[PDB]
């Protein structure tokens, strides 16, 4: 009944996919063959992410899309090669090459009808589709440009359905490409107009948590992507397990987005800890909530003390009881460091779910009795954009790469157009924070 469709775009999307679907298989007891041995029926919990074949083989409701065959071919060949349906792993021949115009205007149009055709088949299998979960990077040509095209098309075919959007935003300082500002700014329109709720994370924040909370000196993408998977598991837990106070995706959106234009929450997850440190701490309900409001534990390099909270969604898992959630929230409301906007006097949505977190073998996290995932809509996010407008204005003042984009069938008026869209959005975020 309550299905979700996952869409994994580009190298970042595909490689996050590997971490997500490893987790979901283990969380439901599905082997990498797709067999469940515990069917000695009456378990529906898998049905959000998997569909059952009459042979007893469970097939992900996923689509993986890339304009290059290198990242997908590993999936076609590794441990999970039997899990995915062969036609869900769509691939092209040549990457957008970090150029948004290739992903959007020239290369993307070659493969888009295959992706849209496959999404029909998955949506027809559903009977109560909650929405689409999209994973991509801002900085890439395929993640930026092809996703831009894809969500504009999905908006026409499925205008009612929620599109949620997890994305890798560029870090403040570390970077991997030089054209990273142009793609990011040009992306903004589709996150502004075609996404119902967008969660941004940047890699420089997550490198920080893996160093001071997991004691890992040299984390790779495999460590980061495992943290992202735990967030998505928690948002969808109330679709999959029993709980005292289950939150649906529709109900989740109603309590975070106060205006249609203002839909950019920060994600945070707690506790993140090594098992060597979990030995010296009690992970009580109060303790884990305080850790969600620390600036050092945010997944974007922005400081919430420089802005105002509009609304917060707290999702708790495991050995948690309402008596202590009430005690924890009451404490937070007393701290003058944490300032809510005056026009939002009841700033919390709470969810409690009985199933505790699973842990992947050989992963970094501890086995824990309980956890909390927090989603928070805050005026402090506007500083992350201003810090990236600067890089765009700096380069663009002298056309530094524009011939690459205009030669691929863009026209240069989009550069100022997109930069003005970002200006308008930043001006809205600063004024909605003003007290009445």
């Amino acid at each position: 009944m309550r299905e979700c469709i996952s869409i994994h775009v580009g190298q970042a999307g595909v490689q996050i996919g590997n971490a997500c679907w490893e987790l979901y298989c283990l969380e439901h007891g599905i082997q990498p063959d797709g067999q469940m041995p515990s069917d000695k029926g009456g378990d529906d919990s898998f049905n959000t992410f998997f569909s059952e074949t009459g042979a007893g083989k469970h097939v992900p409701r996923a689509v993986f899309v890339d304009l290059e065959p290198t990242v997908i071919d590993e999936v076609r060949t590794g441990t999970y090669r039997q899990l995915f349906h062969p036609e869900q792993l769509i691939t092209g021949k040549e990457d957008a090459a970090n150029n948004y115009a290739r992903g959007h205007y020239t290369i993307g149009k070659e493969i888009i009808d295959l992706v849209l055709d496959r999404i029909r088949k998955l949506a027809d299998q559903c009977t109560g589709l909650q929405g689409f979960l999209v994973f991509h990077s801002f900085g890439g040509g395929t993640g930026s440009g092809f996703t831009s095209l894809l969500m504009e098309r999905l908006s026409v075919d499925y205008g009612k359905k929620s599109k949620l959007e997890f994305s890798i935003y560029p870090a403040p300082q570390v970077s991997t490409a030089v054209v990273e500002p142009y793609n990011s700014i040009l992306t903004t329109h589709t996150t502004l107009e075609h996404s119902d709720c967008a969660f941004m994370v940047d890699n420089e924040a997550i490198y920080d948590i893996c160093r001071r909370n997991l004691d890992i000196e040299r984390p790779t993408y495999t460590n980061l992507n495992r943290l992202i998977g735990q967030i998505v598991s928690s948002i969808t837990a109330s679709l999959r397990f029993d709980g005292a106070l289950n939150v649906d995706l529709t109900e989740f959106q109603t309590n975070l987005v106060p205006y249609p234009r203002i839909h950019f929450p920060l994600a945070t997850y707690a506790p993140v800890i090594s098992a060597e440190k979990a030995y010296h701490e009690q992970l009580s309900v109060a303790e884990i909530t305080n850790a969600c409001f620390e600036p050092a534990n945010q997944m974007v390099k922005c400081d919430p003390r420089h802005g105002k909270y509009m609304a917060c969604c707290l999702l708790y898992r495991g050995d948690v009881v309402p008596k202590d959630v009430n005690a924890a929230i009451a404490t937070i409301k007393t701290k003058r460091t944490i300032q809510f906007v005056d026009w939002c006097p009841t700033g919390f949505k709470v969810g409690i779910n009985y199933q505790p977190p699973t842990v992947v073998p050989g992963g970094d996290l501890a086995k824990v009795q309980r956890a909390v995932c927090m989603l928070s809509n805050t005026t402090a996010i506007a500083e992350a954009w201003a810090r990236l407008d600067h890089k765009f204005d700096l380069m663009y003042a002298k056309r530094a790469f524009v011939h690459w984009y205009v030669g691929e069938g863009m026209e240069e008026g989009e550069f100022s157009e997109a930069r003005e869209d970002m200006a308008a959005l930043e001006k809205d975020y600063e004024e909605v924070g003003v007290d009445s």
Partner: protein, 426 residues
């Protein structure tokens, strides 16, 4: 899916190209017979990039070998791997160019073009999705300089949208190999600026410096120098042919490297390089790898970065390493050395990490630098050209081939604009 066609022009082109095919056959595990003996199933997954398949499990290079006189190619065929090349891909004249760019460009080489273009069509049209073309040559010569630029100008009309890369040896700052060297080099650069997407400026006199100062070799032969160049050549393509955590093909690099369409001359480098004795004193780490990669002594070009500003940089790391440590190191170098990077590009370095190091080595990197210091190369050539041309010292060898003297003044003006184009960003 991303096939490369390899071109070899002239004496230096063939001697380098022969070494390149030995180097990458060792990575893929191809015997001199042309048959596969590699241990890893990952070695054949992308072998299509450089080789065609043949019946019986034999692989042949997608290479075409060109010379105006066969003498050098006979030495190539007498070598150990010289049997792997398809015999129909040797294209040879019967009269040398004489180090005269006009002979190679208008008189001798113009009669040979059609034979080469038939081989290029037949190789290129076999590809499922051609990535582009790759030429090895020298600018100081007659066949490399003259006909190499003729070929480039023709195939870029037949295939405008494909990538065009030149690995080109350029004349060195203080000992010439050829008396007429600066005419050939000046006329040839005038062809490159119009018709190439990337150019890598190798200089033989920098390679002697690396062999002496870093490798401590007492008797380096051109077999050693051509090995260094081939390691650079294979490093740039590795992400097309092995899996990695951040893939990066030729086009992705060019997009991130060339801000304006003329500014496409790059300085290569390779790391690690160590002598036999020092091997025991190293500490194999990404930092130590990064330190040598930016060292001015390690550049394969006779231009010094300290005299200019980097526009853009690429590092293609090979080996299983932590992404955080790489991202950390490339930020750290930019923050300290703020004077050596242009102000108006916020991040100058492109990174790409592959999983498979070369055999017998833990980690490796290939460096590409686009630097305003490259004007130093063209400006010292420009002065020598002017010193000769005002006295018309050797023009009768070129005008007797029907060349027009206006074409010499044109090449000055185009090369002098190019040095001005770089200067404005110093």
């Amino acid at each position: 899916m991303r096939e490369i066609v390899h071109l070899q022009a002239g004496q230096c082109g063939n001697q380098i190209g022969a070494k390149f095919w030995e180097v990458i056959s060792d990575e893929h595990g191809i015997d001199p017979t042309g048959t596969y003996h590699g241990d890893s199933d990952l070695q054949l997954e992308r072998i299509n990039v450089y080789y065609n398949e043949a019946t019986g499990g034999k692989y042949v290079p997608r290479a075409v070998l060109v010379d105006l006189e066969p003498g050098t190619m006979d030495s190539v065929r007498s070598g150990p791997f010289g049997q792997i090349f398809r015999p129909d891909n040797f294209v040879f004249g019967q009269s040398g160019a004489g180090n005269n760019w006009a002979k190679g460009h208008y008189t001798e080489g113009a009669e040979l073009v059609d034979s080469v273009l038939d081989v290029v069509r037949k190789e290129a049209e076999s590809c499922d999705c051609l990535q582009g073309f790759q030429l090895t040559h020298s600018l100081g010569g007659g066949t490399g300089s003259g006909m190499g630029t003729l070929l480039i100008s023709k195939i870029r009309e037949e295939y405008p949208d494909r990538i065009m890369n030149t690995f080109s040896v350029v004349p060195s700052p203080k000992v010439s190999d050829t008396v007429v060297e600066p005419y050939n080099a000046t006329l040839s650069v005038h062809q490159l600026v119009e018709n190439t997407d990337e150019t890598y400026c190798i200089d033989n006199e920098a390679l002697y410096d690396i062999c002496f100062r870093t490798l401590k070799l007492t008797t380096p032969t051109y077999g050693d120098l051509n090995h260094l160049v081939s390691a650079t050549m294979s490093g740039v393509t590795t992400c097309l042919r092995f899996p990695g955590q951040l893939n990066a093909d030729l086009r992705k690099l060019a997009v991130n490297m060339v801000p304006f369409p003329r500014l496409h001359f790059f300085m290569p480098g390779f790391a690690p390089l160590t002598s036999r004795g020092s091997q025991q004193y190293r500490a194999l780490t990404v930092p130590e790898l990064t330190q040598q990669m930016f060292d001015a002594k390690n550049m394969m070009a006779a231009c010094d970065p300290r005299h200019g500003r980097y526009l853009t940089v690429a590092a293609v790391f090979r080996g299983r390493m932590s992404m955080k440590e790489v991202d950390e190191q490339m930020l750290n170098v930019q923050n300290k050395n703020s004077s050596y990077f242009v102000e108006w590009i916020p991040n100058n370095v492109k990174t790409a990490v592959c999983d498979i190091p070369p055999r017998g080595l833990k980690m490796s990197a290939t460096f590409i630098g686009n630097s305003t210091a490259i004007q130093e190369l063209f400006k010292r050539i420009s002065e020598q050209f002017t010193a000769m041309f005002r006295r018309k010292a050797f023009l009768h060898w070129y005008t007797g081939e029907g060349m027009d003297e206006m074409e010499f003044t044109e090449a000055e003006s185009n090369m002098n604009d190019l040095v001005s184009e770089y200067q404005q960003y110093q």
